[PDB]
Amino acid sequence: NIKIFSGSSHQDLSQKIADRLGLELGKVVTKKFSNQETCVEIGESVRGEDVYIVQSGCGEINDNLMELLIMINACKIASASRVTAVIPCFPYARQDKKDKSRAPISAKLVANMLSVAGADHIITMDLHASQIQGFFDIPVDNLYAEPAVLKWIRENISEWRNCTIVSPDAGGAKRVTSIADRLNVDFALIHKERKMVLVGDVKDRVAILVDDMADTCGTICHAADKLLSAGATRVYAILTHGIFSGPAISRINNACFEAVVVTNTIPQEDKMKHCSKIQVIDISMILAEAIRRTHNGESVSYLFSHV
Amino acid sequence: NIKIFSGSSHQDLSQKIADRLGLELGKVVTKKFSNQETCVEIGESVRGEDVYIVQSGCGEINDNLMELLIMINACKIASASRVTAVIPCFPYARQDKKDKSRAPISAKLVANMLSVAGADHIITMDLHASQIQGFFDIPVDNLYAEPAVLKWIRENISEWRNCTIVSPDAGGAKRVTSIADRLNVDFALIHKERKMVLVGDVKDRVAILVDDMADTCGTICHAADKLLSAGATRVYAILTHGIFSGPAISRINNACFEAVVVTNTIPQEDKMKHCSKIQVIDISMILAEAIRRTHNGESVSYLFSHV
Amino acid sequence: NIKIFSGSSHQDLSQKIADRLGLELGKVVTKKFSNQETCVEIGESVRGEDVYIVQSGCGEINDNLMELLIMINACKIASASRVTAVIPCFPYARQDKKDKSRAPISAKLVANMLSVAGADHIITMDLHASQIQGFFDIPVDNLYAEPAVLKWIRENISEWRNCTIVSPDAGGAKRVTSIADRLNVDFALIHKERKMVLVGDVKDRVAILVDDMADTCGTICHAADKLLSAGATRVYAILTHGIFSGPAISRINNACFEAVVVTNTIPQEDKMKHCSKIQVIDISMILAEAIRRTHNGESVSYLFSHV
Amino acid sequence: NIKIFSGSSHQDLSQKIADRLGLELGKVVTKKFSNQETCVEIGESVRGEDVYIVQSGCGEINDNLMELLIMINACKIASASRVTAVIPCFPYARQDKKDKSRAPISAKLVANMLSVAGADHIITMDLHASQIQGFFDIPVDNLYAEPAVLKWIRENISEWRNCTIVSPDAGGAKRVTSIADRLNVDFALIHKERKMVLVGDVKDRVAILVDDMADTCGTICHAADKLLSAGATRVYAILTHGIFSGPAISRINNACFEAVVVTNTIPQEDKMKHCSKIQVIDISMILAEAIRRTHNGESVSYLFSHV
Amino acid sequence: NIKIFSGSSHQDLSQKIADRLGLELGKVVTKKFSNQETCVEIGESVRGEDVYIVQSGCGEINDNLMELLIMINACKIASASRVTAVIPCFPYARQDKKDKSRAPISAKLVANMLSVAGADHIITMDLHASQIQGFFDIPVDNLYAEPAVLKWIRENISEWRNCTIVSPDAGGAKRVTSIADRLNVDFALIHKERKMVLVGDVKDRVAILVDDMADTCGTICHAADKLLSAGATRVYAILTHGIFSGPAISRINNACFEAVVVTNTIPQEDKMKHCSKIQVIDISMILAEAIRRTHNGESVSYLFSHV
Amino acid sequence: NIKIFSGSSHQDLSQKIADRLGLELGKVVTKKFSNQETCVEIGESVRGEDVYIVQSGCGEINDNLMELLIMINACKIASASRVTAVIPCFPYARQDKKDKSRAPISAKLVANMLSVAGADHIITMDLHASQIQGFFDIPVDNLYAEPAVLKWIRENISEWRNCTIVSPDAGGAKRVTSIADRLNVDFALIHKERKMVLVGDVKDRVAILVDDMADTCGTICHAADKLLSAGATRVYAILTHGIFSGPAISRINNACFEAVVVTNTIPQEDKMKHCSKIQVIDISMILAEAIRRTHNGESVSYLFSHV
């Protein structure tokens, strides 16, 4: 009754979810021209079934987005009972506001695209802004990496009871403040000026940079230096979405990080090769658990505060 | 060609907007049962015209929302060319995210309700979150009180060049940093720890509390006391939306606020009587200008910076 | 698999339906500001479930309507399998036509609001006009109080075999005529003139005023006098929706009514206090029965001609 | 800028409307197979224009409805600025409610069909029920033959000042009372009792049967006989829509009707031949005027009262 | 859980499908005025059920289309779980493109009509163009008569291993080419010139005209002559949709056809009377099989390449 | 009033269109991460204007499609009066049917994506299938290169009066027959038999290969060889869309083609360098003219025939 399909080419995160559910991934033959025009042929019947399409990648976002959208459509047109998009890292999520300029809210566009494509339900992790849920009329489940992050912290940082959770930007205050209270520790905010400033005591404490996403890593690297200047004994960085475009890993090796921790929301195998500082938290259990519970009609909320 | 109608009973802000445009308000007969069931009858032909309904109030939020929605329907059903909702303060704007519980996203409900009522375009001021624009498929113009707020600070606060802009909660971080930078001054945050802390220096300087909206005033009140304990010379409070429910007036009079600044986004004549500390920035010119420029096809974006 | 939630504060009619189904009402925490801005947090998981939200009240129609709309939304966004609005008295139902004026068809607006909010199905009683069903694209079940009214008549009025069913207005002719034929008795119509006239023999017969709704009661009280002037031995009034705004009960005690009968579609406990003439028919069995049968996939039509 | 097209084969009413406006009808080539499959080709550019398709007929209601729908599609698909459906008689208008059975609401289907075909606005005369306006989300203008009907009565019925306006069924109560009041005269109702009664006095006066539409004429025929038995001097019959199927003509000739009044909402030249009693009120001026004023942005509401 | 209703009056194809499924057809009372205005009353409850409405006919396409649309609506409004339109011959299917003229794409209109009427799923046979599937957002299953046609060929034409599949028009090339490869034989195309030309060797071979549809038969009759002139020993014609308007059967008897084969997608009983050349393939097994499998959630694709 | 924007990096075709109209292109700042996440900021006010976004490219089809979609959103969200997509080559146009497998209809996805992005109208050239127009509810103008192609043949091919127009697959039958007739010459088809045949005579005459689009060129290449074996004097190849991936250039240089004709629907400057045989028909005048006439309200249909 339940079927899991993998988009992209990285069937890694997909397979783990499949394994944890006692299932194999559905057959998909995918052809691509030099145009990167994507052809999909669902290798098996999904009529009357509860279909889950997992999208992992974020290396070529437009190819990946279109591949997902095409698959959703193929399944919806083949009489699937329900089509759920499992998008651990939500594409164009940083484009959720106009910011005083004639910009698109591309995250709303993407949400409209997923909707008009045939998605009935969305399972995602750590929306860049929670308000992105409101870009849908279908239900969205926004899972938190926090519980697993909270857990990683207590087990890997001896000093966690005396640390400071730091936000690298002004927008991330609520997240770090929500984590700092749970752990019962200090918080601190960094803000890049529109002409980097830190607010909060970080002195003689290990500082933990927490954000939902890292990309070029300019921000976290600069915040790392800034924190050490402020008297932090060491700096960690925990981010759920580790995009790591180009220079990011050269920068991670150059900056004084104890470790940069991410979830496998995005494939990290190749990056861990040329970067020893990177550690990965496996979030496939949470996803597998969201899927299993969506299909059974159980509470997926347990996953908001339990691993 | 242009037509301006007032929802509510508070002709207050609408009349000024009609004035700045050399217009009178359209004839409306609105009848209300003891039930509060709202009857509306448009007293002239809107056929083919550019309709602007101004909803000012926030005293009975469900009443005023229904009144506005019904007026939109009536106009759209009477062959209006365009129907534009002028909502200086967007109702249910705080409810823009689930926030880790089985809660509704009520600001998305409102957006959908306005849309299905026949809204073509929206004009509003300081959306509690920028991403609410994304809750629509119709164009949204979100104006800023910021210029008028910067203007006020510089001209009414002698010590402003060395003040600290303070966010009463961790949510308004982006807001105070943007003001703090434009004014090239310091920021600081306050946070109620889930069992009240201050990050950033405020000592021997004036602190300005900046928030988008206030209601009961409890938060800005306990924030002002924390600020006073931290050695701020004096505390100001600037809000673009001044709801001021129940205890707010006394609490504003009793607490240490130098002054309390609001806009006439929400009627403030009654509150002025019982409270001397309050200053009101008239925003009718900005709104009037957004209307003139929506109708003409001109750049309302100039209003993001020019008073 | 089935869950019942109560909106409003009057959990009375809700509980009875819950009892008749061997169920308890779902947990809902509701917060309201002085603004009457409504916050809802569904206290339990509704994922995959068949959710029924009962709305009773009609005292503050806009608060009640918004509370319902918010709850529907909360449930739809929490992955409910189906959300059914159980609205015994349909709000703004009297606003179902333009009536030669620039009015809204607010009943259509309300229907659009319920739709865009996430309702999948509607269960209601005695639509002011049957055509309101057509304001939806979702299915609507319009239950009739008639069977229970027919029953109340045969059991409480000794003379029922020789009575006259009277319509207080020209619009209610079809209803009273449908009831008069069943019982095998006379009908009679009243009409207020646009400068009160009765058509039909009422002489030496007990007259029964039948309408779907009573409010201020001006109409039924004036019709009561008119009927007695016409030679009616006594006058009853049976109405399914007993709003009873302000003066209505002072008027009921003043006019020569034998009894005014309503259904508990609207809470009558407080009104029966200062009014002895008021009697209530319990319609919770019909509603409980509509719900039980919607969820099981049985015929709810039996309830159109059986109690 | 304006463009008027005729659906059907009955150029009859369209040509007059085009005349009153100083316009010729747009070139249409419509081809029909023995199948009655309708082919339509627009014979000139409608790109950027205000299109008005006039559908007059009601001889083969499915044919004429499809023809009209296809013409709308064609124009909307050829970049017409606006497409307006002129349907003097709204098809399936009687089917506006389930009426206690598993029936469709076909007038809501029609509304939806017209809308999804690309209709922007509707002009119609005497909707069988006002609430049908609610079946749309597009603007509806519903014109009245009433003024033209009042006008006719006063000028053609000598006894009119003491006549009785009679509704042939209980449904048309509101209709006859509105006419009866405007003329300051008596009303009366007729009802076929579900196993024919008259309520109201008609004795020694002329009775005018008023209904919105007639078809087979059985109802107005048995009504006229009841009226004659009740001692009406003479019986008139006034309908805005004269469908007149099969037996209608003979039955109108045989029965006692002084005259039978209709509008040219539906073609009446053929029926005039075989039936001398029939009088036709031309409504082309009213329709022509609704079009002129929809296009200009003027008050069509003046047509609710001014001939 | 599954219900089959027959539209039209031809309950023939409907009954066969019903028989093959161990089911009786649902009760439908249908009233029609001289107007051909269609009334439907579903004689039994369809609440929670999987409803299938079969439309056979194509004699009066607009009556048939409206009857279907009305039934879908009646069922959707009576709380059917799912409504599937089983339309063996898709109406207006030949109107799927603009063809360099201001025409409607009526097939898209029809698809929009079926959608807005309440259909959730479509089962059809041999779409005139496969692209018509894309006129929907609901799923469409386009069954092929080919497997049964392939079978009929091997069993009724001794020479099938040496025949030529001929397309009567340029648009039908893909179909005949797909059939010619399966059988492992030649193909040939005919094209009527815009001032009839054949491409391909037909000499000393039995030629088989294959198209999806035949109507007046002008085309196939003219192609038959043309093929015999080209040296074909005999000519067959296999078409899935045998409309056979007026002259078609007089023409079939006059032209040198060995046999004209159609499916009973359209009623052929009356036409086989005055035409001996006509043979019918029963496709009720394929349809019954599509229905049975849609409802069970099995693969209906087996029916694309198996009888 | 008019505004022309260029999507992509290929200002190539847009600039010419802007030239032919006496316009400059609107200011756009588009920023792209290594991710290929597309950021777009409109550099001037489009409020109230007629927007035309030109998307030329087809080098990275997902990139260019996303870029175009985002630009549409941005403009529609900035109060543009109308947004029109100019897509000379419609992306995913080949995927217009399931074709007997569980495939998506990706050209319908694209249509839906463009629509939900805020597209009001579309201008395109030679849709791979006419029925794709049906995939929209918005107006589509589908222009032909045909006149420009006929023009080219007559003027560049000496032998044209006795040439044969050849379709490289069985799909393009309609295409080559339409050209063959207009030119009053012969047609012929080629077909790869599913285990390459030619139907129609080509011997001792020039064969022109006509197709709508080519990519790898394999099909037109094996077609040219078949044609050469059949005794065509020389082979030409005419395509309206010249994608030319990977091996296409060498294969065009090595194979026997006299010349290869394309339009500048897709950029062709790079391909010209490495390939001498290629001729390009500039279509900027046709597109420029469709824009001028969409904006003015003029007949773009004249472009179906007049160069």
What does this structure look like?
The structure is a homohexamer of 307-residue chains. By secondary structure, chain A is of the alpha/beta class. The first copy, chain A, has 2 domains: 1-144 and 282-302, Rossmann fold, CATH 3.40.50; 145-281, 3-Layer(aba) Sandwich (Rossmann fold), CATH 3.40.50. In chain A, 32% of the residues lie in helices and 23% in strands. The first copy, chain A, has 9 helices and 14 strands. In chain A, the strands form 3 sheets. A 7-stranded mixed β-sheet of chain A has the order 10-9-8-11-12-13-14. A 5-stranded parallel β-sheet of chain A has the order 1-4-5-6-7. Chain A has a two-stranded antiparallel sheet with strand order 2-3. In chain A, strand 2 and strand 3 (38-42) form a beta hairpin. The longest helix of chain A is centred in the first third of the chain and has 17 residues, at 61-77. Chain A starts with a strand and ends in an 11-residue tail after the last helix. Chains in contact: A-B, A-C, A-E, A-F, B-C, B-D, B-F, C-D, C-E, D-E, D-F, E-F. The interface between A and F is large, with 50 and 50 residues.
